[PDB]
Amino acid sequence: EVASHRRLFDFFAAVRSDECNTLSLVRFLELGLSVACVCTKFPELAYMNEGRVQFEV
Amino acid sequence: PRYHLTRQVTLTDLCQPNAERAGALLLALRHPTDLPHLARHRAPPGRQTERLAEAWGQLLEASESGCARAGLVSFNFLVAACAAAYDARDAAEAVRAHITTNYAGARLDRFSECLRAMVHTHVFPHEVMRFFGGLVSWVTQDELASVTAVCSGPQEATHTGHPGRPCSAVTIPACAFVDLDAELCLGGPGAAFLYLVFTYRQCRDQELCCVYVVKSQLPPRGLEAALERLFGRLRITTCTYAAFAELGVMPDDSPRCLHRTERVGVPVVILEGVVWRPGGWRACA
Amino acid sequence: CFEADIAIPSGISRPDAAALQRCEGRVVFLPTIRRQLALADVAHESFVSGGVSPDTLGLLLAYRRRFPAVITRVLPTRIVACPVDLGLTHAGTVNLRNTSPVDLCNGDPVSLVPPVFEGQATDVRLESLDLTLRFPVPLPTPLAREIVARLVARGIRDLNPRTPGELPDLNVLYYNGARLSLVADVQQLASVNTELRSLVLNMVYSITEGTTLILTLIPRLLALSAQDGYVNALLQMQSVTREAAQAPMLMQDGERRLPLYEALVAWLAHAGQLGDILALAPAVRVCTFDGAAVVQSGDMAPVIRYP
Amino acid sequence: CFEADIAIPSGISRPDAAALQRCEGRVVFLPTIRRQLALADVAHESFVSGGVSPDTLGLLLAYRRRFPAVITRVLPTRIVACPVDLGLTHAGTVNLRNTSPVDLCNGDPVSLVPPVFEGQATDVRLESLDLTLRFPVPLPTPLAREIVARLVARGIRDLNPDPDLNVLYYNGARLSLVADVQQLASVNTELRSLVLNMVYSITEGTTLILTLIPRLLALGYVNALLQMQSVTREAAQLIHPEAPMLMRRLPLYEALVAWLAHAGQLGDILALAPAVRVCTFDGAAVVQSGDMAPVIRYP
Amino acid sequence: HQPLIARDGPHPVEQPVHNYMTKVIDRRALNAAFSLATEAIALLTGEALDGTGISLHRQLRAIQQLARNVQAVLGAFERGTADQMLHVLLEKAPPLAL
């Protein structure tokens, strides 16, 4: 889903891994509103060809 | 295996790669002590075959072979020596201001005589000074030479980015803006196919010599009719003019450039990323 | 491979998607080197020039200035093609489809010829994308060089009439048996004319000064005719050599130029190159790993580099 | 690379074993590319094509037909060769044995016939199973195209007799083409069929063109441009040859294909295309006879 | 050690040649091979996976491709074992009318 999702993303590069002063540091992240405007989500799109949604009014 | 190294030990009587750039389109000098004999042969007898017997003999005067044979010819050494020959003057002659201040026209003046003497007795300068590569390393001594300047496919212009993190290495100059002939002004997207053509004029301009690179997205079968068109030096009759081999593919037309900064201000074209298909020569018409 | 793709641009006739599946191993002439390209320059409507379609000699000249490409894998979204002119660096020996009536050999050079056969038109039609497709016919190269000389000389007979209407058709071919009849429908003149001129102009330069001494030994040829087998079989019946039999011209300047050796050089320069300047260059060679000595019609033969 | 194995057959002698020790690094031709092969596909006895021994034509048909293989390491019960024709360009460095010219740092050497050099040199015979391995000669592209047109020119003066073509200097050395004492009398009978091929393709076409072009231009862009680049060349050849020689359309155009069919044969026969390249590393750039050389795959 | 029927009479004496005769072993190839596609190379190693069971499900359909192929080539030797015996018997078989 989410935690199961990137757990193979870290592993994919992991098996591809075999294949005078400080203050050199800045930090960063961005979430929270990163789900609000999105205003829905389906995760896990597999090998897919066509997505249909039909409307009945 | 998309990485190779080649090495030939010669003199710095020729190119002096310490005086060259990191990127130079080096020729060898295959059959170096040759051509007293083929001066006599392969020509009709109205050519007075005792000319090249002395002509190359004055070249190595300016440069005894010893155990370090005469070879590793620069790209500069043909452009400036033909600068007075072909149809570009005071701009191709800026290559002579590049050589004589860094390399020497003493070796040019003996060889510009050869460029009127080799082509005289039908000893045409194709299939002599065969292609070697792009001057990777210059592990040469003071007055002697030991160069690794790899042949052998695309790896010469891949192994340029990997060695130095800052900017780019070699990046394959054209060494004259008059050179890299801007053929196909009928412009479109694709990949570039580079070739090495010696265009001649036999007894009209008194055995003309020319060295420049073409620019085309054209096959070898679409290049020979492209060698019959676009020329004005047809006015000959002997024959077998305009030889060419494959300098290989530049698999990008986007990375060509326009500069005048090198090493004397000489115009120069950056060409990044090249499949160096070594190719083969052809000279019949 | 230096991968090059051609996408499926707009819509699909649902059986015709399967028609693109059975074209695996065929050849696309795409006049570029692209990372992506439309399917519009692919078909024969792009082979058609301004207003007029090429003849089977013009299609040779149309297949001159374009680039062949091998169908590698067929997706419903794209078709991955490998650029024959550059990307033949395949130790995996990217595979081709033989669409030809001749069972070939092992070890043949293979050059491409337009469809000119009487029954192997290779015409597949797309109506959703209105395009016509002529696949080239891969053939062995001596059999390929036996064809192009016929079709130009058939168009040489398109310049002059003169003779009675019963002409030798140039339309019966011979491979070990196997009577082949091809199509003679239209002969465009400029495709004949430019092909005829290089047949003239190269045969000009292929004669030299020392060549003339060989012409003296034409009566020497028939002296070997009635005294061996090899020569008499070499001497053709439909030849001018048996017809012309029914001298140094001194002009000797210097005589240290090797005049006889210099004759065979420039003759080979232009008369030695007559198959490849008229037709397409061979770069495909028959190479099967299993020890199979021939490759059937319709098979998938492994393909190696320039001969 | 894809190393291929050639099987040693049954009982051979130690000099037959030592004959296999004097060939480590030669050139070998084979019909198919099966991962296990036998010696029966290798020998000169496997070159029979019409029931007789092949000539230098009959070899150069096969020498342009079948496939080169270079033996890296010799073995009991096997022969390991990493073949040239498989692999991507400029990979899989292999090692050859030079013969009398140099093989400089470049040159792109070409396999060709033995009897253009000493015929019973490099015709190494196995004594026990009684077969013959005639190894081809690896000559570089300028001189390989040079010597092929000289002996057939020497075959002309040996054909119907009444300078000396055989000196042929290299860059430094003087290359003695003539191995007189027993070879040259075998030369003009082992290039015997081949000289007829270089002749008959000349006698046909020149006597065809002089009844083609006068039959053309009046039977117009190709008309005036016929002698445009041939002014005082073809009309001068019409002045020289048509006078001191002799002079029909429906057999003529039938002969048009047939000569040019023979022409397309000879281009595949002649000119000796490069197959493998010398472009070494950290060498003296100049190879000598009997010494190895790092040789890379594709021209 | 062949028998002797050592004779009476002045015909000369029998002599037991208890000779050692040798033979010679041959060498045979018996080669077999099997394909493997352009996919299932990242698969069956661990490169092209995901948290989807579909990634695991097409990882199954490479395993059920090899699991039929490994028995096919390991079968082909036991099939090939008998086929050699039919050659090496018939190579030393004279025709029984003679």
Question: For chain A, what's the residue count?
Answer: 57
Is there a contact between B126 and B281 (Cβ–Cβ < 8 Å)?
A: yes
C273: chain B residues, CB-CB within 8 Å: 284
Is there a contact between B14 and B143 (Cβ–Cβ < 8 Å)?
A: no
Q: Pseudo-torsion of CA B77, B80, B84, B86, nearest 10°?
A: 80
Of B108, B110, B117, nearest to B207 by C-alpha is B117
Mutate to test the interface with C, among B221, B227, B234 (most CBs of C within 10 A): B221
| CA atoms of D57 and D206, how far apart (whole Å) | 23
Q: Do B42 and C33 touch (CB under 8 A)?
A: no
Residues contacting B188, CB < 8 A, separation 6+: B217, C32
Q: Do E24 and D10 touch (CB under 8 A)?
A: yes
E46: chain A residues, CB-CB within 8 Å: 11, 15
DSSP, residue by residue, C181-214: -B------HHHHHHHHHHHHHHHHHT--SGGGGG
The neighbouring-strand residues paired with C96 are C301
Q: Which amino acid is at D126?
A: L
Question: For chain C, what's the residue count?
Answer: 307
* Block residue for tokens 């000893």: B123
Is there a contact between D33 and D83 (Cβ–Cβ < 8 Å)?
A: yes
Instruction: State how far the alpha carbon of C288 is from the alpha carbons of B32, C307, D86, D89, in Å.
Output: 43, 15, 12, 20
Residues contacting E2, CB < 8 A, separation 6+: E16, E17, E18
Q: Do D106 and B130 touch (CB under 8 A)?
A: yes
Residue D79 tokens read as: 């022969």
D172: chain B residues, CB-CB within 8 Å: 33-34
Put simply, whether D162 touches B (Cβ < 8 Å) is: no
Q: Which amino acid is at C158?
A: D
The neighbouring-strand residues paired with C4 are C81
Q: Pseudo-torsion of CA E6, E9, E15, E16, nearest 10°?
A: -10
| CA atoms of D108 and D103, how far apart (whole Å) | 9
Angle between helices D192-209 and D249-269 (to 10 degrees): 140
Backbone angles phi, psi at D155, to 5 degrees: -70, -25
- Portion 8-47 of C in contact with D at CB < 8 A: none
For CA atoms C206, C207, C211, C215, the dihedral sign is: positive
| CA atoms of B283 and B244, how far apart (whole Å) | 7
Instruction: State how far the alpha carbon of C257 is from the alpha carbons of B260, B285, C120, in Å.
Output: 48, 20, 54
Residues contacting D28, CB < 8 A, separation 6+: D6, D42, D68, D69, D70, D71, D81, D133, D135
Is there a contact between C277 and D266 (Cβ–Cβ < 8 Å)?
A: no
Q: Do D207 and C244 touch (CB under 8 A)?
A: yes
Strands B212-213 and B192-198: antiparallel
Strands C67-74 and C27-30: antiparallel
The helix (run of H) or strand (run of E) holding residue B198 is strand B192-198
Q: Which of D222, D245, D264 sits opposite C145 (nearest CB)?
A: D264
Instruction: State how far the alpha carbon of B224 is from the alpha carbons of B128, B158, B178, B282, D214, in Å.
Output: 21, 29, 22, 10, 28
Of B176, B169, B180, nearest to B273 by C-alpha is B169
What's CA D212's distance to the chain center, in Å? Answer: 33
Q: Which amino acid is at C50?
A: G
Of D296, D109, C88, nearest to B4 by C-alpha is D296
Strands C67-74 and C96-97: unpaired
Angle at B32 between CA B31 and CA B35, to 5 degrees: 75
Is there a contact between B275 and C86 (Cβ–Cβ < 8 Å)?
A: yes
Burial track D60-70 (b if 16+ CB lie within 10 A, e otherwise): bbebbbbbbbb
Cβ contacts from A onto E, under 8 A: 20
| Coil/strand/helix, residue B110 | helix
**Which stretches within B6-90 are classed as H helix?**
37-40, 52-62, 76-79
Residue of B nearest to C255 (CA): B45
Residue D106 tokens read as: 């470049």
| CA atoms of C96 and C294, how far apart (whole Å) | 14
- Find the distance separating the first CA and the last CA of chain B, reported in whole Å: 37
| CA atoms of B78 and B83, how far apart (whole Å) | 8
Integer Rg of chain C from CA? 23
* Block residue for tokens 């009309």: D235
| CA atoms of D100 and D122, how far apart (whole Å) | 12
CA distance E96 to chain D (A): 28
Residue B275 tokens read as: 């499949």
Strands D36-38 and D4-7: parallel
| CA atoms of D219 and B284, how far apart (whole Å) | 30
DSSP annotation of C216 reads G
The neighbouring-strand residues paired with D81 are D4, D71
Q: Pseudo-torsion of CA B77, B80, B83, B85, nearest 10°?
A: -40
The helix (run of H) or strand (run of E) holding residue B227 is helix B224-228
- Portion 206-225 of D in contact with C at CB < 8 A: 206-209, 211, 213, 216, 219, 221-222, 225
3-state secondary structure D125-139: EECCCCEEEECCEEE
Residue B225 tokens read as: 């009719």
* CB atoms closer than 10 angstroms to residue A55: 4
Instruction: State how far the alpha carbon of B20 is from the alpha carbons of B258, C148, D229, in Å.
Output: 20, 51, 43
* Block residue for tokens 């050869």: B114
| CA atoms of C241 and C239, how far apart (whole Å) | 5
- Portion 72-131 of D in contact with C at CB < 8 A: 85-89
Is there a contact between C122 and C134 (Cβ–Cβ < 8 Å)?
A: yes
Put simply, whether D251 touches B (Cβ < 8 Å) is: no
Phi-psi region of C270 (alpha: psi -120 to 50; beta: other; left: phi over 0): alpha
Residue of C nearest to B222 (CA): C65
* Block residue for tokens 């420039």: C266
For CA atoms B21, B27, B33, B35, the dihedral sign is: negative
Residue B149 tokens read as: 């300047």
3-state secondary structure chain D: CCCEEEECCCCCCHHHHHHCCCCCCCEEEECCCCCEEEHHHCCHHHHCCCCCCCCHHHHHHHHCCCEEEEEEEECCCCEEEEECCCCCCCCCCEECCCCCCCCECCCCCEEECCCCCCCCCCEEEECCCCEEEECCEEECHHHHHHHHHHHHHHHHHCCCCCCCCCCCECCCCECCCCCHHHHHHHHHHHCHHHHHHHHHHHHHHHHHHCCCCCCCCCCCHHHHCCCCCCCCCHHHHHHCCCCCCCCCHHHHHHHHHHHHHHHHHHHHHCCCCCCCEECCCCCCCECCCCCCCEEECCC
| CA atoms of C279 and C57, how far apart (whole Å) | 9
Put simply, whether D36 touches E (Cβ < 8 Å) is: yes
Put simply, whether A14 touches E (Cβ < 8 Å) is: no
Integer Rg of chain A from CA? 19
Q: Do B278 and D299 touch (CB under 8 A)?
A: yes
Residues contacting B257, CB < 8 A, separation 6+: B269, B270, B271
Residue B166 tokens read as: 């800052």
Put simply, whether B220 touches C (Cβ < 8 Å) is: yes
| CA atoms of C31 and C64, how far apart (whole Å) | 10
Is there a contact between D154 and D180 (Cβ–Cβ < 8 Å)?
A: no
Q: Do C238 and D221 touch (CB under 8 A)?
A: no
**Experimental technique behind these coordinates:** cryo-EM
- Find the distance separating the first CA and the last CA of chain C, reported in whole Å: 19
Put simply, whether D229 touches E (Cβ < 8 Å) is: no
Angle at C42 between CA C37 and CA C48, to 5 degrees: 135
DSSP annotation of C102 reads S
Q: Which amino acid is at C231?
A: V
Q: Which of E24, E26, E29 sits opposite D36 (nearest CB)?
A: E29
What's CA B137's distance to the chain center, in Å? Answer: 19
Residue of D nearest to C169 (CA): D254
> Within 13 A of D196's CA, how many CA atoms are on the CB side?
21
* Chain B neighbours, 3+ Cβ pairs < 8 A: C, D
Residues contacting B49, CB < 8 A, separation 6+: B39, B40, B43, B121
